[PDB]
Amino acid sequence: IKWAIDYITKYFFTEGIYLQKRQREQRLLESYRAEGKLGEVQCRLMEEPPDRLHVLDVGSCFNPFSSAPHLEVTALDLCPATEDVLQADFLKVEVVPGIREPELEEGSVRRLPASHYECVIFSLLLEYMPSAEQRLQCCLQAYDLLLPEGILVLITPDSQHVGKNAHLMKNWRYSLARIGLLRVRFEKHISCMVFRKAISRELSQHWASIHREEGMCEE
């Protein structure tokens, strides 16, 4: 979808949002260090964004945006409609270092490269999950797939969710911060939510710890 490609462009290239949020996290880290906390935290920052970004789209049975000069797009789904969407169960794929391209067995993705993608897009993926645990498991997978400071983009039309609540992890910043993801954009025909792989998972954990009361209230 256009919104995600437009946000990706702003985040890495035209508005520098990756550096805005880097500053905000760095100023939060210093806040805690002036509190006597998080002294030994080491941060993981991305290099200058490459000229071709690596984008993984999960949950679309059609391939929405073809690969283009500055975008290498890999699309995956349990039930692909055509051949340019790879068949995979996102929850079963093993996310591993030491590779750079999907590893296929019998026409099915078995392994994906860890810490490789600038952006992971969930195209209704969470609406297919039978439980809140498995929705969190999708986010755990995305986290392992993302490069430092990469983004997980959730793009959900209002017509395509069930339950009057589009599953966007909006009430889940506590648990998502626990795994290293901080919310960086929410915009409302469609709902769009973006999480960022924070410069330090320990930093994000400590933010969750300070907001544990509100976190457990929302669950």
Asked if 147 contacts 46 with a C-beta cutoff of 8 angstroms, the reply is yes
| Binding residue ranges | 59, 77-78, 89-90, 123
**Going by CATH, does the domain composed of 2-218 fall within 3.40.50.12160?**
no
| Binding residue ranges for S-adenosyl-L-methionine | 59, 77-78, 89-90, 123
Domain boundaries, the chain: 2-218
| Binding residue ranges for S-adenosyl-L-homocysteine | 59, 77, 89-90, 123
**CA torsion 184→188→191→195, rounded to 10°?**
0
3-state DSSP call for residue 214? Answer: helix
Cα gap 41→181, rounded to integer Å: 16
Cα gap 194→162, rounded to integer Å: 20
From the list 143, 130, 127, 131, the residue with the least C-alpha distance to 195 is 143
Distance from the Cα of residue 100 to its chain's centroid = 18
Query: End-to-end distance of the chain based on CA atoms, in angstroms?
Result: 30
**Tokens encoding 5:** 């490609």
Solving technique: X-ray
Strands lying side by side in the sheet with 71-77: 86-87, 71-77, 53-58, 117-122, 146-157, 190-197, 181-187
Using alpha carbons, list the distances in angstroms from residue 25 to 52, 85, 102, 207. 26, 36, 32, 10
Amino acid at site 17: I
